[PDB]
Amino acid sequence: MSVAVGYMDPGNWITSMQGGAQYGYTLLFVILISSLAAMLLQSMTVRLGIATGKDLAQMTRHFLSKPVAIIFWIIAELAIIATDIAEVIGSAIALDLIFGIPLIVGALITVFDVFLLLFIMRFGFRKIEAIVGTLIFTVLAIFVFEVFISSPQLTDILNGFVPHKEIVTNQGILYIALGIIGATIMPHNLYLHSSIVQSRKYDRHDNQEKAQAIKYATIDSNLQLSIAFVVNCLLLTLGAALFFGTKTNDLGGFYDLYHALKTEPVLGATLGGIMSTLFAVALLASGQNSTITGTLAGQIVMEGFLRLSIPNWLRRLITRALAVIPVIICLIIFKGNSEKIEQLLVFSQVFLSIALPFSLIPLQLATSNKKLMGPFINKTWVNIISWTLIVILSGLNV
Amino acid sequence: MSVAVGYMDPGNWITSMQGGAQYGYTLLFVILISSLAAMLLQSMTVRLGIATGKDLAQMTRHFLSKPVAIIFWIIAELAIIATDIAEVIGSAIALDLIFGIPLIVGALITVFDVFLLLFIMRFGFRKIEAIVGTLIFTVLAIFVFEVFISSPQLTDILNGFVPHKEIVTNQGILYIALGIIGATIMPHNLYLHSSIVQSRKYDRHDNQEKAQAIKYATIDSNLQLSIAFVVNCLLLTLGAALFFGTKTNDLGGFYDLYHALKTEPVLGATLGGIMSTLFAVALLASGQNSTITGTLAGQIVMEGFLRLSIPNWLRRLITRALAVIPVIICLIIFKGNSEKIEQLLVFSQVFLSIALPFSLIPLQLATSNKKLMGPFINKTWVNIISWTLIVILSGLNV
Amino acid sequence: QRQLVESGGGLVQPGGSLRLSCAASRSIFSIDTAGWFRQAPGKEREGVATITRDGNANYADSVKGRFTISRDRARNTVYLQMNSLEPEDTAVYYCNAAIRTTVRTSAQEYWGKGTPVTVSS
Numbered sequence: 044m045s046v047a048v049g050y051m052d053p054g055n056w057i058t059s060m061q062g063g064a065q066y067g068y069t070l071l072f073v074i075l076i077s078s079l080a081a082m083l084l085q086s087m088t089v090r091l092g093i094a095t096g097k098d099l100a101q102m103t104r105h106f107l108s109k110p111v112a113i114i115f116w117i118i119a120e121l122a123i124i125a126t127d128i129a130e131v132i133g134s135a136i137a138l139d140l141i142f143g144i145p146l147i148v149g150a151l152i153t154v155f156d157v158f159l160l161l162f163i164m165r166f167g168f169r170k171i172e173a174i175v176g177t178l179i180f181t182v183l184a185i186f187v188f189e190v191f192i193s194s195p196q197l198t199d200i201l202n203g204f205v206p207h208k209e210i211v212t213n214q215g216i217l218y219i220a221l222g223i224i225g226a227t228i229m230p231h232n233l234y235l236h237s238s239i240v241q242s243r244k245y246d247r248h249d250n251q252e253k254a255q256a257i258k259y260a261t262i263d264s265n266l267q268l269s270i271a272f273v274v275n276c277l278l279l280t281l282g283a284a285l286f287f288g289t290k291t292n293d294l295g296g297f298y299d300l301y302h303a304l305k306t307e308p309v310l311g312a313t314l315g316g317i318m319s320t321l322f323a324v325a326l327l328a329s330g331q332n333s334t335i336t337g338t339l340a341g342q343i344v345m346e347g348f349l350r351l352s353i354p355n356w357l358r359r360l361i362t363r364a365l366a367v368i369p370v371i372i373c374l375i376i377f378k379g380n381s382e383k384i385e386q387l388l389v390f391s392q393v394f395l396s397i398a399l400p401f402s403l404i405p406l407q408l409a410t411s412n413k414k415l416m417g418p419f420i421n422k423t424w425v426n427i428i429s430w431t432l433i434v435i436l437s438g439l440n441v
Numbered sequence: 442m443s444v445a446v447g448y449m450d451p452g453n454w455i456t457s458m459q460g461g462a463q464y465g466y467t468l469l470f471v472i473l474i475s476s477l478a479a480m481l482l483q484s485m486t487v488r489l490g491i492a493t494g495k496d497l498a499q500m501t502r503h504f505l506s507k508p509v510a511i512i513f514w515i516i517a518e519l520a521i522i523a524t525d526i527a528e529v530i531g532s533a534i535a536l537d538l539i540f541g542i543p544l545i546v547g548a549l550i551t552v553f554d555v556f557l558l559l560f561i562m563r564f565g566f567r568k569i570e571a572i573v574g575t576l577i578f579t580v581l582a583i584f585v586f587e588v589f590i591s592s593p594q595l596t597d598i599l600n601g602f603v604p605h606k607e608i609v610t611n612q613g614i615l616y617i618a619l620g621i622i623g624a625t626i627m628p629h630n631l632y633l634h635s636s637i638v639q640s641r642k643y644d645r646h647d648n649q650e651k652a653q654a655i656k657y658a659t660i661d662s663n664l665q666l667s668i669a670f671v672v673n674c675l676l677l678t679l680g681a682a683l684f685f686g687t688k689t690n691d692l693g694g695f696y697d698l699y700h701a702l703k704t705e706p707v708l709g710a711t712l713g714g715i716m717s718t719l720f721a722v723a724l725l726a727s728g729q730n731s732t733i734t735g736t737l738a739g740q741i742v743m744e745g746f747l748r749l750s751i752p753n754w755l756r757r758l759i760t761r762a763l764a765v766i767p768v769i770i771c772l773i774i775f776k777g778n779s780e781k782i783e784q785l786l787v788f789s790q791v792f793l794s795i796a797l798p799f800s801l802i803p804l805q806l807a808t809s810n811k812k813l814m815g816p817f818i819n820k821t822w823v824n825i826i827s828w829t830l831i832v833i834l835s836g837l838n839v
Numbered sequence: 840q841r842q843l844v845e846s847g848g849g850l851v852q853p854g855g856s857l858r859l860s861c862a863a864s865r866s867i868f869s870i871d872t873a874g875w876f877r878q879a880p881g882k883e884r885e886g887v888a889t890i891t892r893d894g895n896a897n898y899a900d901s902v903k904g905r906f907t908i909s910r911d912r913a914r915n916t917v918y919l920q921m922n923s924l925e926p927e928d929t930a931v932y933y934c935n936a937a938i939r940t941t942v943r944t945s946a947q948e949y950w951g952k953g954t955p956v957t958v959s960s
Binding site: 777 | 866867868869871892893894909912913914915940941942943945946
C-alpha cells in the first residue's frame with residue numbers, strides 16, 4: 044500500500060560517516076563516481092538478466108571448469124560472509140546501546156535468532172514495513188536538522204577538483220575510498236538482480252520486443268540508486284559538520300555519533316536521549332533487513348556454481364554462524380574495544396570491494412558475446428583496470 | 442541510438458528567467474510546487490490513458506452536450522494557439538538576433554515555413570536530434586559556468602518560508618507565478634499523453650494485470666518532469682545572479698540576456714560573441730521542436746470534441762496563421778518594442794494557465810468513476826480550488 | 840567625448856528623406872536615453888527629440904510630423920528618420936547618449952561628433 048523500503052545499510056553508514064569525521068569533504072567526489080558506476084553495472088546485468096535465460100552464476104559455470112569453479116564459489120561465499128559480518132556487528136552495537144547487555148551476548152542472540160523473522164512473517168508485512176519506513180524517514184529528518192552553519196563552496200570545490208595527490212597519497216584515504224565503493228556496489232546485489240529480473244511477465248522468448256521490460260526495470264533501478272546516492276552524500280557531510288577541524292580527530296564510528304547526538308547542547312537535554320534511542324532503533328532495523336535480503340543471493344550462488352541446493356533456514360543459519368566466528372575471535376582477543384570492532388567492520392567492507400573484480404570480469408565478458416551488447420563497453424574496461432591498480436597498490440603498501 | 446531530446450521551451454525560458462531578474466529568489470518555491478503538481482497529474486491521465494480505451498477528449502464528449510462541447514473545444518483550441526504564439530515569437534527573436542532581419546519578416550518566414558520539417562524529415566532524424574542535444578547540453582554548461590559567487594542560505598531560506606504576504610501581495614508576483622505554473626503544466630501535454638499511452642503493447646483488455654505498463658510509464662514521466670524541474674530552477678537562479686540588486690531593475694527578457702553574455706567582462710571579448718550565437722541557435726531549435734510536438738495534440742482535440750478530421754499540414758498551417766495574426770497586430774500597433782513583445786509572450790503563458798482548469802476538472806471527475814481510482818483525490822481537489830481563487834483574484838485586481 | 844559614431848548625412852533635395860543612426864563603438868550593453876541635437880551655423884544647439892528608457896519619443900514643437908525617433912534594442916543603435924525635408928533643417932545633427940557598459944556599472948554620459956545635412960536644389 045504505502046511506501047516502505049530500507050536503504051541505509053550499516054556498511055555504508057559507517058563508511059560514509061567515518062569519511063566525514065576524519066578527512067572532511069575530500070571523499071565526497073569518490074562517492075558520486077562509485078554510485079554512477081553501479082548504475083551502469085545494474086544496467087548491464089539486467090540486460091543479461093532478461094535475455095539468455097540464465098543467471099550470472101550459471102554464466103560463470105559455462106565459462107569454467109570444476110576447479111576454478113570451486114575458486115570463484117569460494118570468492119562469492121566470502122563476499123556474502125563479509126556482508127553478514129557487517130550486519131551482525133551492526134545489530135550487536137545497536138543492542139548494546141539501547142539496552143546495556145555486553146557485546147558477546149548480543150552477538151550470540153543475533154546469530155541464533157532468525158526465528159523472529161518467521162514469527163513476524165506469520166504476523167504481518169504491511170504494518171512492519173510502514174513503521175520501519177516511518178522511523179527511518181524521521182531519523183533522516185533529524186540528521187538534516189542537525190546540520191548547521193556551513194560553507195558551500197568548500198564542499199563544492201572539494202567535490203570537483205578531486206585532489207589526486209590527496210586521493211592517492213594518504214593510504215588512509217584509499218582505505219575509506221575502497222570502503223565507500225565496495226559498500227555502494229555490493230556484488231550480492233548483482234547476483235540477486237540478475238536472478239530477480241527473470242520474472243516480470245516478459246514473453247520469455249516469444250517477444251523479441253520485450254526490451255520494454257528492460258527499459259522499465261532500468262528506470263526503476265536508476266531511481267533506487269540515485270536516492271541511495273543522496274543518502275550517502277548526506278551521511279558524509281554529517282560526519283564532516285559534526286567532527287571536523289578539532290583536536291584528537293576522533294575517529295567517528297557509531298558510538299561517537301550516538302553520544303554527540305545526546306550531549307548536543309542546542310537540542311535541549313531530553314531531546315538528546317530521544318533522538319539517541321530513535322537512532323538506535325534505526326540501526327537495529329537496518330541491520331535486520333540487510334540480512335534478510337541476501338539469503339536468496341547466497342542460495343542463487345550455490346545453486347549456480349555447485350548445482351546443488353538446500354532449504355533456506357539451514358543456509359542462513361550456517362552462513363550466519365561462520366560469519367559470527369570472526370566477531371567473537373576479535374572480541375576475545377582485543378578484550379572489547381569499540382575502536383577495534385568498528386575497524387573490523389570497515390575492513391570487512393574493503394575486503395568486499397577487493398573481491399568485486401573476480402565477479403565483475405565475467406559479467407563484462409558475457410555481455411560481449413550474445414545478441415544484445417553495449418556499444419561502449421569501454422567505460423567498464425577502464426573501470427576494472429583502474430580498479431585493479433588501486434586495489435593492488437593498497438595491497439602493496441602493506 | 443544516443444540520447445537526444447529538447448526540454449527547454451521558450452515559454453518556461455522567459456518566465457523563469459524573468460522571475461529571477463525582477464524579484465530574486467522568492468519565486469523559487471512556486472516552481473517546485475508546480476512541478477510536483479504536474480507529476481501527479483501525469484499519473485492520473487496515464488491511468489485514464491491506459492484503461493477505458495478512450496482519450497480525454499472523448500471523455501469530455503461523453504459528459505457534455507453539443508453546445509458546451511463547442512465551448513470546451515474553443516478553450517482547447519485557444520490553449521494550443523497560445524502555445525503556438527509563444528513559439529513563433531521565440532523563433533522570430535532568435536532570427537533577429539542571429540541575422541539582423543527585422544521582426545515582421547522573421548514572423549512571416551516562420552509562419553509559412555513548415556516545409557523545412559518535411560525536408561529535414563526526408564533528410565534524417567538521428568543526426569539532427571544528436572546535434573541539437575549536443576548544442577543544448579553545451580548551452581546549459583555555459584550557463585552553469587556563468588553562475589558565480591552566491592549566498593546559499595539566501596536561496597534556501599527563500600525557497601522554504603514562502604513569504605505568503607509576498608507571494609500574494611505584489612500583483613506583479615502573481616503574474617509571473619501563474620506564468621511559471623501554466624508553463625510547467627501545458628494542457629496540450631495532458632491530451633497528448635492521454636493519447637500516446639494508448640499504444641505500448643499492453644494487452645488492451647485481455648490483461649487486467651497490465652498495470653505493469655502503468656508503473657513503467659509513470660516512472661518514465663516522473664524522470665522527465667524531474668529533469669525539467671532542475672532546468673527551470675537553474676534558469677531562475679541565473680536570472681537572479683545576473684540581474685538582481687541593481688539600478689533600474691532591468692526587466693530581463695531575452696535580449697538583455699543575449700547582451701549580458703556578450704559584454705560579460707571575465708569571459709574575454711570574443712567568447713562573448715561565441716556564447717552569444719550559441720545561445721541564439723539554442724533558442725531557434727527549441728522553438729521548432731516545441732512546435733512540432735503539439736500538432737498531434739491539436740489533431741487529437743479536434744477529433745475528440747467535433748469527431749471530425751483533417752490532414753496534418755492544413756491543421757498546422759491554419760493554426761500557425763491564426764496564431765501569427767496577434768503577433769503582427771501587436772507589432773504594428775506598438776511599432777516594435779522588445780519590451781512589448783516579451784510582455785505579450787508572458788501574457789500568453791499566463792492565459793494558458795488561466796485556461797487550464799476547464800480541462801483539469803473533467804479529468805478529476807472521470808477518474809472518480811471507473812474501475813481504477815486514486816485514494817487521495819483530495820490533493821487534486823485542494824489544488825483546483827486554491828487555483829481558482831488565485832486566478833480569480835488576479836482577474837479581479839484588473 | 841568620443842566612441843560614438845553617427846552616420847548617414849548627405850545632400851538631399853527639398854522634401855526628400857533620410858535616416859541617421861547614432862551608434863556605439865564596441866559591444867555596448869544598453870542605451871538608456873538618447874537625444875538628437877542640431878547646431879545650424881548661426882544659432883544655438885537646439886535639441887530635436889528624446890527617447891527614454893522604455894519609450895517616450897518626445898519631440899520638439901516644430902518637428903512633429905516629420906521626425907520619427909526609434910530604437911533598435913538588438914544592435915544598440917538609436918535611429919532618426921526625417922521625412923519630407925525642408926530648407927530650414929540644414930544643420931549638423933549631434934547625438935547624445937546615456938551609455939552603460941556592463942550590466943552593473945553605473946551610467947555615464949557620451950557626446951557624439953555629428954554629421955552634416957544639406958537641403959537645397
